[PDB]
Design a protein around this ligand. Structure first.
Ligand SMILES: Nc1ncnc2c1ncn2[C@@H]1O[C@H](COP(=O)(O)OP(=O)(O)O)[C@@H](O)[C@H]1O
Ligand SMILES: Nc1ncnc2c1ncn2[C@@H]1O[C@H](COP(=O)(O)OP(=O)(O)O)[C@@H](O)[C@H]1O
Ligand SMILES: [Mg+2]
Ligand SMILES: [Mg+2]
Lengths: 540, 539
């Protein structure tokens, strides 16, 4: 719905439409200064009247240019009010969207938003705004004589024809050529993440074959598109010259007879170059209209996605299907984790324990049943506020581009106090010291500039930042060393004495004692969930 | 460097000869205009009127052709340029992204797209007409002296406005573009971690951090277009006004005794062609601007361009990671004999993965040598070398595609070979339970798989091809009891196959199989000796 309405809010298009008209009227001046002169050459009044009409011409041209220059700065502001309102919604909606549709997710909505702003500022757009006021030119050429604009009609029927033809032989190629370019871009982006192994196992040429299934199909569309577009963009620019010259052909064949003023011989041809003018410039730069309309529809779809916790968690009749999953990954999960309770989630890798984690948090939505936090049904909590009360350390850690302090603070306001205790609790503090420029050390995208073991320590501090009521650690011991594990162990102990409801996905036995309740998963179903001492019995 | 590939082509002289003829053929619109006034003086009969018209039409049908061939050629020039640079950009991006992880993106492919667009665009044809503007200049002044002055004193005005347009946008187009890419890159990188973002609700927080790039892009995109358009507007109106002021002098010179009768218009027409190209240039200097950015960036991006028995040896090796000033490996000295196992243990951050990444030749040292069997400072072509090595990185780097493909390193799908590799790694047990097991669609990186499953497959890829050297960088992170048991069996079989295996792990079981052990600390190889010795001294 809002897809069109966000651009529809700007009603200045009439204010520019009304305005475009006034521009188009002054465009007659070069043609007025054509007839006005030959109505001065014959009467031979060179010294005075020409120069007034010259002054008239120059002055009106400054007025012409003035009424034409300010049109541009309006579309620019239109592009900003367009940008500012869409800018935030694009960046926020993308994160929520890239979880429901992880297959298709990139910064393309920005580049397309960028592509639109370019269209509004582009010269081709104004060439469209000049067209709805062409019937004025169609008239002034006809009021002088009927044999003239017959060419104007019959040339328009030929020029408009070529412009229409340019679409239907490139509409099917460009829309394809633009898209497959994005697929090739994304494929390379995803692959470049794994550049390390690609170089290790030298499988760059092997991936090149795989990459060619998208790129070779892009070129085949780009070649035909530009070729056919160039073929006809040339026919429209040259027909502007021939048709103008043919006006002299009939502007002489009918001017040797005094039906036409001796000066109107030329003025008639000029007006044709302007009736057929915008269409020429349109087809010449039709790719802008192409890619900005392709970029339009692309940014279009993307925008269609638009108390205090105490510790009780509950799952009732829960079935979860992962985004783009087809098959259910969690089947009939029934569990109630009381406040301040510890929970170890053990089991094999096919179990779906990270899925139970992701659905308890609310990352994944259950297709059946409900997830209740503090009895209250989840999805009623605000995503932005609910985050300050929960802690999360995923399996893939997921640190961000920024400094250590920023990361731990979830890129909130850097509270030198809050950050220290978070690092003191997680034990991350003793690692963050060693960094060149501790706490202020720059971490590359994802955390590439840091050891995975170090990353997880810092990733823990972030989880325990601001003393959350719920803590979900998903295999926080992967990549950790002896010290890092001792740190995690201490954090759990202190956390248990603070009475923080915690869930740890871990099979490390040293921490299994302080668990109270173990949950066993198997084949996407909750096989067992009871007191830890009771589960450990059943496990021997 | 990039230009030497453009300089390869000498067809630009054919562009020269053709563009030359175009400038001659562009005289007809005004010459035909003259031919009209020469019908009038004699009132030469009207069948002759349709004759010169017939001449004009047939001449224009040739004008369009010699001008559309340029479009047919420049179009072809862009393709043979692509096919020469296409693979080079793709294959180097992986090398580049390891040396330049900060600027690691698919951008260099996008810059290629921008150039191919520039060769096809109408704006480029305007540039090819400039060096023969003196032609129109000629007919204009040779006709009348006072006309030639206008053409000089006019050209100097648009050229002025055109040069103003340069150094008031040359500074912002570079920035407006550069930061939009870094805003793109930042988002993509940050969008990989959407899982936490949604969990901890820090999207608005990232937005504040992200605006340090986009707001600077907007302030650059805004000012660049505002300044550019204002100047482009002083060029479009000036062409219309300069053409009108030509008739201003065109009329004065008809009442004075001069042969200006009828060419009064032909001057304005020819002038419109002298000021024709530049008008179309400034109207779209954005393209020329962004292509110059795309040109240099892709040019800069392109500036970077027996069988092993299983003996590895490092000597005086000093390694500094990409984009770090400090060394991460300091004077590492060790030799791994063929078929010898090696455990790399040490505190987290001591530089184990670093020692791994340099043995494999991913990172290059600033000092010292990495020799494989013979003195071989990465003289191997990695495309051939990759067949002989197996690698399981800490981050378990799978790709979008089938398990089969991933295990085969996207080589030809050998129905047999994949399974033997899997049966070795123990992945075969796991791969089957997936629906249409061996031909499942693994999402990009393995999002559609449990990380615990991903590491099993990654081991199958490692082992596949019966590699001489096998490096496993912490292959037990996220492994089932069964999966850990599988890796244990895999290592046993590899030791019977006398493979030279380097396992980075501190697990109890593996240290017993591993023959020799290496202890790391502060990027210095603290120790390297027989396992039975070290293990006992770890008490
Ligand atoms: N992003 C995803 N999309 C679809 N299915 C998924 C996704 N991630 C995991 N799965 C499915 O869930 C299973 C793994 O569940 P997971 O929660 O990862 O268990 P664990 O925590 O033990 O690794 C796999 O069999 C896979 O089919
Ligand atoms: N990609 C990188 N860029 C720059 N420095 C790095 C990078 N990776 C690791 N380091 C540096 O090396 C140290 C850890 O080395 P690493 O190879 O991760 O050893 P380990 O794998 O045993 O942690 C860290 O202190 C960090 O400063
Ligand atoms: Mg998991
Ligand atoms: Mg490591």
């Amino acid at each position: 719905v809002l897809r069109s309405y966000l651009a529809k809010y700007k009603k200045t298009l009439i204010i520019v439409g009304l305005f475009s008209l006034f521009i188009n009227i002054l465009f007659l001046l070069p043609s007025i200064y054509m007839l006005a002169v030959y109505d001065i050459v014959v009467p031979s009044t060179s010294v005075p009247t020409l120069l007034v009409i010259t002054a008239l011409a120059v002055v009106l041209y400054f007025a012409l240019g003035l009424l034409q220059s300010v049109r541009a700065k309006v579309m620019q502001i239109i592009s900003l009010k367009l940008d500012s309102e869409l800018n935030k919604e694009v960046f926020t909606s993308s994160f929520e969207y890239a979880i429901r549709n992880p297959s298709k997710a990139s910064a393309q909505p920005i580049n397309d938003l960028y592509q639109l702003k370019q269209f509004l500022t582009s010269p081709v757009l104004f060439a469209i705004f000049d067209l709805p006021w062409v019937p004025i030119y169609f008239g002034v050429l006809f009021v002088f004589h009927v044999y003239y604009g017959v060419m104007a009609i019959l040339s328009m029927a030929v020029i408009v024809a070529l412009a229409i033809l340019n679409e239907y032989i490139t509409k099917k190629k460009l829309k394809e050529s633009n898209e497959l370019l994005v697929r090739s871009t994304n494929f390379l982006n995803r692959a470049l993440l794994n550049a390390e192994v690609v170089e290790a196992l030298g499988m760059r040429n092997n991936l090149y074959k795989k990459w060619m299934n998208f790129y070779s199909k892009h070129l085949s569309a780009f070649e035909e598109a530009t070729d056919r577009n160039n073929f006809l963009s040339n026919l429209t620019r040259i027909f502007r010259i021939m048709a103008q010259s043919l006006m002299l052909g009939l502007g002489g064949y009918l001017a040797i007879k005094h039906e036409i003023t001796t000066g109107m011989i030329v003025a008639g041809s000029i007006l044709l170059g302007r009736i057929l003018g915008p269409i020429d410039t349109i087809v010449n730069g039709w790719r802008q209209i192409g890619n900005t309309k392709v970029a339009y529809t692309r940014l279009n779809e993307f925008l269609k996605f638009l108390p205090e916790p105490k510790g009780e968690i509950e799952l009732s009749n829960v079935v979860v299907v992962p985004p783009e999953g087809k098959t259910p990954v969690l089947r009939n999960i029934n569990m109630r984790i009381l406040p301040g309770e510890f929970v170890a989630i053990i089991g094999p890798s096919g179990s779906g324990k990270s899925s139970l984690v992701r659905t308890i948090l609310g990352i994944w939505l259950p297709v059946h049943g409900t997830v209740e936090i503090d009895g209250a049904d989840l999805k009623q909590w605000d995503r932005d506020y609910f985050g300050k009360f929960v802690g999360y350390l995923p399996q893939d850690i997921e640190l961000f581009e920024g400094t250590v302090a920023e990361n731990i603070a979830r890129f909130g306001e850097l509270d030198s106090e809050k950050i220290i205790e978070a690092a003191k609790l997680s034990g991350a503090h003793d690692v963050i010291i060693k960094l060149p420029d501790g706490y202020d050390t720059y971490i590359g995208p994802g955390g590439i500039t840091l050891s995975g073991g170090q990353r997880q320590r810092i990733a823990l501090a972030r989880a325990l930042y601001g003393n959350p009521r719920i803590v979900i650690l998903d295999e926080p011991d992967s990549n950790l060393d002896e010290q890092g594990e001792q740190a995690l162990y201490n954090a759990l102990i202190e956390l248990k004495k603070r009475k923080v409801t915690t869930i740890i996905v871990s099979h490390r036995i040293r921490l299994l004692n302080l668990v109270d309740k173990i949950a066993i998963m198997q084949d996407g179903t909750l096989k067992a969930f009871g007191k830890a001492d009771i589960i450990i019995q059943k496990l021997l």
